[PDB]
From a paper:
UDP-sugars are secreted into the extracellular space to function as the paracrine signals through the G-protein-coupled purinergic receptor, P2Y14, which senses extracellular metabolic stress signals and regulates energy homeostasis. P2Y14 couples to Gi signaling pathways, orchestrating a wide range of biological processes ranging from gastric function to immune responses, renal inflammation, and liver fibrosis. To investigate the molecular activation and Gi coupling mechanisms of P2Y14, we determined the cryo-electron microscopy (cryo-EM) structures of the Gi heterotrimer-coupled P2Y14 in complex with UDPG, UDPGA, and NADH, respectively. Despite variations in agonist structures, the active-state orthosteric pockets in UDPG-, UDPGA-, and NADH-bound P2Y14 complexes share common features, consisting of residues in transmembrane helices TM2–TM7.
By comparing the structures of UDP-sugars with endogenous metabolites, we found that NADH exhibits characteristic chemical scaffolds, such as diphosphate and nicotinamide riboside, which are structurally similar to the uridine and diphosphate groups found in UDP sugars, suggesting that NADH may function as an endogenous agonist of P2Y14. The results of the cellular assays showed that P2Y14 was activated by NADH in a dose-dependent manner, confirming that NADH functions as an endogenous agonist of P2Y14. The global resolutions of the Gi-coupled P2Y14 structures with UDPG, UDPGA, and NADH were determined to be 2.88 Å, 2.76 Å, and 2.76 Å, respectively. Unexpectedly, the electron density for scFv16 was not observed in the map of the NADH-bound P2Y14–Gi complex. The NADH-binding pocket in P2Y14 is larger than those for UDPG and UDPGA, with volumes ranging from 443 Å³ to 512 Å³, suggesting that the distinct geometry of NADH results in a larger binding pocket. For example, UDPG interacts with D812.64 and N1564.60; UDPGA with K772.60, N903.21, N1564.60, and N1885.40; and NADH with K772.60, Y1063.37, N1885.40, F1915.43, and E2787.36. Additionally, NADH exhibits unique ligand–receptor interactions by forming hydrogen bonds with residues Y1063.37 and E2787.36. Y1063.37A and E2787.36A mutants of P2Y14 showed significantly reduced activation by NADH relative to UDPG and UDPGA. Our study is the first to identify NADH as an endogenous agonist of P2Y14, supported by cellular functional assays and the active cryo-EM structure of the NADH-bound P2Y14–Gi complex, revealing the NADH molecular recognition mechanism. This suggests that NADH functions as a paracrine signal through P2Y14, playing crucial roles in immune and inflammatory responses.
Residue numbers in the entry:
A (entry chain A): 5 to 53, 182 to 234, 240 to 354
B (entry chain G): 7 to 62
C (entry chain B): 4 to 340
D (entry chain R): 17 to 311
The structure:
Amino acid sequence: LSAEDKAAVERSKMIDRNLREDGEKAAREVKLLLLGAGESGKSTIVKQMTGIVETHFTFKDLHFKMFDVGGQRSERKKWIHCFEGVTAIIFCVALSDYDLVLMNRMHESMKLFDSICNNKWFTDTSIILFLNKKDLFEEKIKKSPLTICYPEYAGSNTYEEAAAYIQCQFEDLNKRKDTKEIYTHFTCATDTKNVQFVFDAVTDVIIKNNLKDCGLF
Amino acid sequence: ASIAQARKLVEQLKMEANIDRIKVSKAAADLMAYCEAHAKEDPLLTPVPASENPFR
Amino acid sequence: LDQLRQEAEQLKNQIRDARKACADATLSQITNNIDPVGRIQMRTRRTLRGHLAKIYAMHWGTDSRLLVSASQDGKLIIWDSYTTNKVHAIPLRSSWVMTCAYAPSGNYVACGGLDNICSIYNLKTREGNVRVSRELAGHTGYLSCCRFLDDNQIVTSSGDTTCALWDIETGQQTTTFTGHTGDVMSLSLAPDTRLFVSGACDASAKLWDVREGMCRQTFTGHESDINAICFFPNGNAFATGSDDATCRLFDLRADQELMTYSHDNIICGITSVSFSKSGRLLLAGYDDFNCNVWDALKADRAGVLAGHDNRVSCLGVTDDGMAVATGSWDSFLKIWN
Amino acid sequence: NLLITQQIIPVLYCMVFIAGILLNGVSGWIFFYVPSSKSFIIYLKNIVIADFVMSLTFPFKILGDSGLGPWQLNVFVCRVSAVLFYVNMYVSIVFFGLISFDRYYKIVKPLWTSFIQSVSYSKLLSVIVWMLMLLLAVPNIILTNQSVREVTQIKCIELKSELGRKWHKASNYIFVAIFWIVFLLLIVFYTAITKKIFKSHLKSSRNSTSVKKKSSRNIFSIVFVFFVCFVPYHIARIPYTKSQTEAHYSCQSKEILRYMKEFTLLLSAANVCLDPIIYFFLCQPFREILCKKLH
Ligand SMILES: NC(=O)C1=CN([C@@H]2O[C@H](COP(=O)(O)OP(=O)(O)OC[C@H]3O[C@@H](n4cnc5c(N)ncnc54)[C@H](O)[C@@H]3O)[C@@H](O)[C@H]2O)C=CC1
């Protein structure tokens, strides 16, 4: 090879080394697609942890990149496949929105959760389901009965029973319970255990993915 | 709001309505003629010799 | 309200009547006499490897040798296709790019995507390192296509149902095209760069005058979102690939769909569309992990480019027509002769 | 006897030969399309190659053990087929060990951080492993070209020179020690992986219980197949090699030892059949390519 050709091949090899290093660094990052409704506590979760809002944070020697696609206002079907290889999906649902309306707000939230969970691009992607505003929901469950959101509800009008019923209703939307797991956490204001819950869930997901990549699960 | 959008759509349809359209036969003949003229200069229609092929 | 809707319906009926009147014959019967192109047996000459995530876009250089590609790993790689060498590797501030463009002069590269911003990078910096030269703010929706129109202005389409011609020096939208109803998914600039066609999610293609800024013609017929669009080499016709398994060739002068390119064995959507140098071959990438080379005149499937383990997301043809580069979601670019 | 190693052992060799050659030929057909994106796939490719070579050596055993065209079949099984079978068997064993170590490195993520451990360049180490195995095995075929003293009695060590016999004993002892090192490492690594799996996944849900149960079943199947196939052979290979290169100390134990060695070697050869169902099947790209082609 000529001197120019040798220099070009050397430059290509340097670029290859840099790309390999970048990919090695990126493969250790945990990708978290953040989804929810307007009334969901996505903003509070982001604050405690233009088209896409990227939040990078390190927890227990794990680097997480959380991508919020709120405000896109476009057709999800044209860009949701960009998150096909995402490590996990954090879906936020406002519990207090069971009594609210835009069609009930919680019904629209359930529809969005079912669409995200049961679409082709997230067949095996795990979902951390945050049920925010548990304090406001507990305060308002004593006056507004849960029947206005779930007419089929027959349990007692207590906070624990209603919260478990809502969580079970959201978990029953999983059409691949054998392969995909939904981690439900009751987030709220002044809650410091949400990031730890995300860390534990993504640790489980990472162990599952490592077992799958090893031909062991 | 709705009235303005409807008026804009009507104006656009009127603009796109009074245009000169040629017959489909003539346009297809022109397209075929363009394909025939540049047939020898298309390296994908016929394989270029490996001597003249930069991707050999 | 009601009167305006009635007038719009009457205008649409008049347009359809004029189109039916000017459709005396069909492209299939006119090209029925010509001999078939035969079987296309293009083979993979080069495999550009180095991308680590799904490749979403590629664009050939006007020298038909350098080739830019965009990957979801936040990388914009400029390849020397002849030697497979990597000329440049630009780290993107946003890894969610879905389009990339190469300046006709070769001095700049455009990229963009879910960040709603078109980034213009200068490759010919005196310092020897590629740095972003401009960031175009606007497009409240994701930016799906960008095409350089000389070195100072660029046409970009986005997911806010609008296109925009930007002046790169000032960074401001010189012109805005606001006729589409669905998300605009693809752009194609005419060889003279005076007109451009945009296909959108409303199953519609629109022809825009760059200088005038208004929509000249609107083309329908597709039953689903149009993902790819490409001008014929003559510039008097274009091809659209959509979410249904059919491509469609429309003609500007006739204002009608000339041809359809579909098969029963094909049920997946179409991601990329390109013509050969003569326009006789129409190359379309599909979701079934392949590319189909159709006889654009005869609508016959001339050949199949297979070798991508994932969906073919993008493909282009060199300006001299020597090769076809197809990128895929399997993080691989394949050059074919 | 006469109806054990001539009328029964060849039949079981034929059964394992067919049930290994079919699966391994299909696996080699599939693996040429599967890219080597990870060291696990590379080791599976090498294991496919080794198992195919073993299955190709099997017909020579079957025939020559059962019957001879010329005595050339028997002297050839001593000379060529057996050496290739043994070298491919030990290649498979050490590649099982390498797979175990990469699984440990990935799943466990051990305290070897700041050390590269086994990441990338696994083609080079695979090549040097093949080269070390063939460096051990080549003298066992080059040195065994002696004349045949008795035409119908052809013991594989009688066809072997003084240096040949010395290196036969050395290679056996070395290969048994290599297998035991790989076996201890495999047990340690799979115990560590099972410990890593035991932690986490505390949800009592379908997904967590399923992943724990499937991973533990796969690990137990791997370890159990490894044990049943190889431990009986290598706990009796040293006494049998002593019996081969022996000062006169035995009369009939030299026969029960040879039956034991033949049956334990048949156990070890059954891994050519038990390998796809525990290693290749669980490989996601291999299974995906097979489901795309075999439908
Ligand atoms: N780890 C090892 O033991 C290795 C051995 N080798 C070589 O391979 C050759 C095979 O040696 P061994 O198997 O220990 O010798 P052996 O006396 O056990 O039998 C030799 C081979 O001939 C066949 N055979 C011959 N007579 C038989 C009979 N009556 N019944 C059933 N099978 C019969 C066996 O299948 C066996 O593979 C040796 O020359 C050795 O040097 C090569 C590499 C590694």
